[PDB]
Amino acid sequence: VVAAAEKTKQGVLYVGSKTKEGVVHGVATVAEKTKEQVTNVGGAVVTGVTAVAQKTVEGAGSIAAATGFVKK
Amino acid sequence: VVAAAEKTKQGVLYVGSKTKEGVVHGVATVAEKTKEQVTNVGGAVVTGVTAVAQKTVEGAGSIAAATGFVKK
Amino acid sequence: VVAAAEKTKQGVLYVGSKTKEGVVHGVATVAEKTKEQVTNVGGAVVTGVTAVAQKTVEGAGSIAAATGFVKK
Amino acid sequence: VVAAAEKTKQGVLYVGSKTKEGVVHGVATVAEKTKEQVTNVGGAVVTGVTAVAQKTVEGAGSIAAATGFVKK
Amino acid sequence: VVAAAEKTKQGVLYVGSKTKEGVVHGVATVAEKTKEQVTNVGGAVVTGVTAVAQKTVEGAGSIAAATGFVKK
Amino acid sequence: VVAAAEKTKQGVLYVGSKTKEGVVHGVATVAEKTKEQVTNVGGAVVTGVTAVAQKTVEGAGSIAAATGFVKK
Amino acid sequence: VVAAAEKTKQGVLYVGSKTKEGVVHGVATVAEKTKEQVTNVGGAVVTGVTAVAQKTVEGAGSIAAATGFVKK
Amino acid sequence: VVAAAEKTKQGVLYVGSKTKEGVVHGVATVAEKTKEQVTNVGGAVVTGVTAVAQKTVEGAGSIAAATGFVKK
Amino acid sequence: VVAAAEKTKQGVLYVGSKTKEGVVHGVATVAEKTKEQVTNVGGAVVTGVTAVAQKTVEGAGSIAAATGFVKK
Amino acid sequence: VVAAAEKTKQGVLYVGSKTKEGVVHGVATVAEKTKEQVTNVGGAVVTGVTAVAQKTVEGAGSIAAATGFVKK
Amino acid sequence: VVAAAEKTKQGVLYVGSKTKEGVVHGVATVAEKTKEQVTNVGGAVVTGVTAVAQKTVEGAGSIAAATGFVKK
Amino acid sequence: VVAAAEKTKQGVLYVGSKTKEGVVHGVATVAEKTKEQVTNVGGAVVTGVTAVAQKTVEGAGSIAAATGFVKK
Known about the structure:
The structure is a homododecamer of 72-residue chains. Chain A has 72 residues and is an all-beta fold. Chain A has no helices and ten strands. The first copy, chain A, has strands at 3-5, 13-15, 18-20, 23-24, 28-30, 38-41, 45-47, 50-54, 60-66, 69-71. Chain A is flat and about 60 Å long. Chain A starts with a strand and ends with a strand. The relative contact order of chain A is 0.39. At the A-B interface, strand 1, strand 2, strand 3, strand 4 and strand 5 of A face strand 1, strand 2, strand 3, strand 4 and strand 5 of B. Strand 7 (45-47) of chain J pairs parallel with strand 7 of chain K, so a sheet runs across the interface.
């Protein structure tokens, strides 16, 4: 689960968007008459209408994540 | 679960957006008549209409996360 | 599960979009009359209408992730 | 499950899109009268209408992931 | 399951799209009256209307993934 | 299951598309009155209307994947 | 349009109802960007959840109605 | 359009109902970008969930109605 | 259009109903970009989930109706 | 168009119903980009899930109706 | 178009029904890009899931109706 | 078009029904790019899943109807 990263050293960008009536959902757990119910989220959940990422991680970066469900 | 990162050293950007009536949800746990109910969120939850990230992590950065559900 | 990355050293881009009435879902768990119910998300969940990624990871980067369901 | 990558060193791009009424789903688990029910997601889930990736991983990058279902 | 990659060193592109009423699904598990039900996703799930990837992995990159279902 | 790749060193492209009413499915598991039911996906699942990949893996890249169903 | 009625002269009843979440509409005129807009109602408009009429007009009764739209 | 009626002269009933989530509409005129728009209702509009009429008009009764649209 | 009726003179009933999620519409006129739009209703419009009529018009009754669309 | 009726003079009934998810429509006029649009209803429109009529018109009754579309 | 009727004078019944997911339509006029569009209904339109008529018109009754489309 | 009827004067019945997923249509007029479009209904339109008529017109009854399309 260990993560690592390193880095050493030694023009128009356009985005446009037009939208009418946009309905967005993410993670859902819909239920009825359930003796138990669990939701466990361990990661990135990006929801949106215009989810735009521009020129990210130009330098150095690292992400580590560990989730886990245990039931006995 | 250990994370690490390092860094050593030694033009128009445009985004536009137009939206009418946008409905956004994230993590949900909808239920009826449930003897137990748990929600456990351990990560980044970005919800929005225009979720725009520009030129992030130009230097160095690191994220670590660990969530965990245990039931006995 | 270990991840690693490294890096050493020693023009118009256009996107356009037009949309009317777009309905987007992600991970779902729909159910009725269920004695148990679990949702466990351990990864990146990107939902949207215009999910645009431009010029990411120009430098160095790394992601590691480990999720796991255990039931006894 | 170990991943690794490295790198050493020593013009118009156009995308356009027009859409009317687009309905997008991701991972789903639909059910009725089920004594148990589990959803376990461990990877990238990109859902959208215009999911556009431009000029990503110009430098160096690495992703590792391990999910696992165990039931006894 | 180990992956690795390396790299060392020492013009118009057009895409257009027009669509009316496009309905897209991903992974689904539809069922009725089922004593158990499991969904386990360990890989990349890209769903969309215009899923366009342009000029990716110009540098170096690597992906590793391992999912696994065990039931006893 | 081990993968590896390496690389060392020492004009119009057009795509157009027009579509009306396109319905796309991916992996599905439809069932009724089933005592057990499992879905296990370990690979890339690209579903769409215009799934266009242009000039990918110009540098170096590698993908490894291993999924596995075990039932006793 | 003339109406008339006359009359001369010379045991359990049960209704039960149970309802959850009932949404009822009547006459509607929904519009956008309309140079003129008219609604003209001349009759009985009974809207409800349990609209119950029991043992009405046991004697004598009469109803007359005349509505009319004129535009020149 | 003239109506008339006359009359001269000289045991359990049960109804039951059970409902969950019932959505009822009546007369509607939905529109967009319309230079003119008219709604003209001249009659009985009974909308409901349990619209029950029991033992009506045991004696004598009469209804007359006349509506009319004129446009020049 | 003239109506008339006359009359001279000289045991369990059961109905049951059970319903889940019933969606009922009546007269509708759905449109887009229409230079003119008219709705003209002159009669009885009974919409419902359980529309039950029991033992009506045991005596005497009469209904007359006349609607008319004129456009020049 | 004239109607008339007359009358002179000188045991269990059971109905049961069970329904899940019933969607009912009546008269509809769906359209797009239409220079004119008219709806004219002159009669009885009974829509429902359980539309039950029991022992009606035991005595005497009469209905007359006349609608008419004129366009010049 | 004239109607008339007359009358002079001088045991279990069972119906049962069970239904799951029933979708019912009536009169429809679906269209696109139409310079004119008319709907004219002059008669009885009974739509439903269980449309049951029991022991109607035991006495005397009469119905007359006349609709007519004229276009010049 | 004239109708008339007269009448003078001087045991279990069972129906059962079981149905799953029944889709019923009536009169339809589906079209695209049509310079004119007319629907004219003058008669009884009974649509349903269980359309059951039991012991109707035990006494006397009469129906008359006349519709007509004229275009010049």
